[model samples]
Target: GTLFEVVKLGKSAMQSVVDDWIESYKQDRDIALLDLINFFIQCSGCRGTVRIEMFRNMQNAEIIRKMTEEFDEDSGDYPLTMPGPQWKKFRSNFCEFIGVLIRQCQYSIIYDEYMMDTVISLLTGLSDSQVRAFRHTSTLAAMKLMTALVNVALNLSIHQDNTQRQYEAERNKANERLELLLQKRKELQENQDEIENMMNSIFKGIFVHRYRDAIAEIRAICIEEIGVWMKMYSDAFLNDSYLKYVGWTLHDRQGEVRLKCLKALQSLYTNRELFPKLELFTNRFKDRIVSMTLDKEYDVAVEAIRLVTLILHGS
Candidate 1:
């Protein structure tokens, strides 16, 4: 009945506070589910400064259960394969919240493999939606969560390295800490490797849809992220098949879309290994870029000029 009160504070403020706690504690780290939902609704539409006493909520399970909720598997849509380029941008922020949740609750209910599986499944389903905006936003949400998952894996790797280094200076390979670290490493490594492989799989197909999307913002941002994935995970997405998506964007109608694609191509062309792979790209789009060089817009023409020239020198 107290949908009368809500909050509107800084989020990064929460992030900063949490980070401070982690560093200071060298360590450490909710409310009920339904009232929290109602509170959020109130925050959106209801306004007030009325005060109410907090409840005596005894069970943590009530909140945690709702946080990691998954979709219906019995519907036979587990893989989220039907595709488009629209998604809810808010889910990206939601995923960010979960990132902070994992940071604080790594050994708790929030960071379980089951929870992650649920997260990816929900995103993939949202990503599979027929709506254009829904898919792109889902792509972003997937990316942020993936970033968080990688950070978790990297932390485990860092500790595993230090402990192994410690063990190396000792005599017993069967040391207790060694075994514990080994076990945790395997567990964390599974998460690390699993998320990496799964993320690549998810984006590979989604890239095709986003490049062809109608929205300039989606297409333009897609180009930037294409650059990121190509540069960041060349081992996974640097092939002709993948580059084709970004490559085709050279013909986009919007100058911003075309310009972003050209800039992305410019960066990739600057890489020696990448130049070799994108050779077919120049063959297909080089002449079109000549047209782009004379674009009415200065920014597009400038970037188009840079890309064509880079291709000339590199090829």
Candidate 2:
């Protein structure tokens, strides 16, 4: 109820305070929105006890419903709606709220059906026609929310039960959610231009560092998904920029990441259509493998040697 009140007031007559600030700084609405977000966060302490109570009460569904409603059909008129001040504050505060929820009370939130449906809708857009409707800022906010949610899902699927059947059940649900999101993206033609950037966002979100980081197991799941996507959407990996980011991972300090990097490269190497285009990348990859072959990590170096021997002879 407290959280609902905050969202209520966020858009109520009191919202005119934020609107006035935006009016005063028409040229700087973005900065004004950030100020509004701070005001909301401080006044409600939404990220503190309020957030905990909200999730405890299964109120995340209400917030999620609000987020989903934001993408209803009418917004499709402007395919790239630059986020307005209200949108910026709404999304920013919502994302921070979820971030705190996941960090502190993930077990409670992940199992909510409304939260699950809202996540699918957000990733896939409210409808097929609404795909890729978000501008850069909106997409980033959506990705932040989904990444937190998915990470919590992964943690639950792993630790909730050690039994094989239970583990498979949870993993299947998480993977199914991921699969449906990608499937929805593929069904829309508008998403074509955004596919590369979308993949980049997933990679960056999972692998990049921050004040808090994903555990190695979660990062490994992301690496595996990248490999799966490389096969499923060969054309996306054909983009040189995406390929370049993959190659850069070959030098990752995480040995599991480095190993998965090698596996992804091998898949590309074997894909007839994509292989020929990787000439420059091929040489760069060879150099990385050579360096890895001499790596102090015994398992990594051994695998690197095996890969080098296979690729050098064109096996």
Candidate 3:
């Protein structure tokens, strides 16, 4: 707590110091995790003359830059060439950095243009925009952003599933482990409303738009992560209509592109709970998937064969 002379530097530096201390506390990942909510509760406030300053943290920086600059479509994998090289670097950082906060804090702080809403809007706005200038850059970030979200959300969901079973097991005049289960429930509980809000609100259109995007790089990320949403929000995402997108993409001209659809379809086949009844999947894509076996790449052929086998064997 010896944050001496540090705050005297300037308000921005002082705010960063405070963030670091809280991060240190969260690394303790102890009760400080709970207290972090109160911090958001305070600053998240917007009053009549709200002119509070914010530092250059990447999450804040991305949203700020997005208002003025077009996203750098060329920034993925190779960061060596952006118009303002250092500027592109910081914007890319926001994609996963904001996601890290969502995983830890459950990121429900939404009223106006706060982080959750801002992120939702920024991504939903540009990722599928018809304007060619902004589309790929926006899709690149949007794709990563949603992937991080599902990765985090799915973890919480599984824990919550365990939490429910734990309670019922303990309720039957039975004694059992409650500490870890209870802690997860507490977190899951805090995040529950926002999770529902996000699942219902944000996912409705953007994913559909991205899945059919023109860029091969963007399409690959979408294909891979689509399997994940199927893993979690199946009711919202796993229907025939959405499955049609995954099915229709079976012939993505790029090798890795189509390979991802096979990968996703293979996983979808294994999950019997949400598995398609085949009204349209097999009706439309069966011939397409079968053809993938003769594809040029060894990697593509093997995965397609494996994916083809599972569905044939199961249904």
Best by TM-score: 3
Candidate 2 global CA lDDT score? 0.47
Can you rank all candidates by lDDT, best first?
3, 1, 2
Error of 3 at 240 (Å): 0.9
- RMSD each, Å: 11.1, 17.9, 10.0
Can you write out model 3's per-residue Cα lDDT over 136-209, one digit (the tens) per residue? 45555555556555655666677789888987677665233666566667878666556556555455646677
lDDT of each: 0.57, 0.47, 0.58
TM-score order of candidates, top first: 3, 1, 2
Estimate candidate 1's alpha-carbon lDDT, on a 0 to 1 scale.
0.57
- Tell me the lDDT of model 1 at 28: 21
Q: Which one is best on lDDT?
A: 3
The TM-score, computed over Cα atoms with residue i paired to residue i, of candidate 3 is 0.60
Model 2 TM-score, 2 decimals:
0.38
Ten-residue region with minimum lDDT total, candidate 1: 43-52
Clashes of each: 9, 0, 1
Better of 2 and 3 by lDDT: 3
- Candidate 2 wrongly placed segments (more than 4 Å): 1-117, 120-214
Which of the predicted structures, 1 or 3, would earn the higher TM-score when compared with the native?
A: 3
Candidate 3 has an lDDT of: 0.58
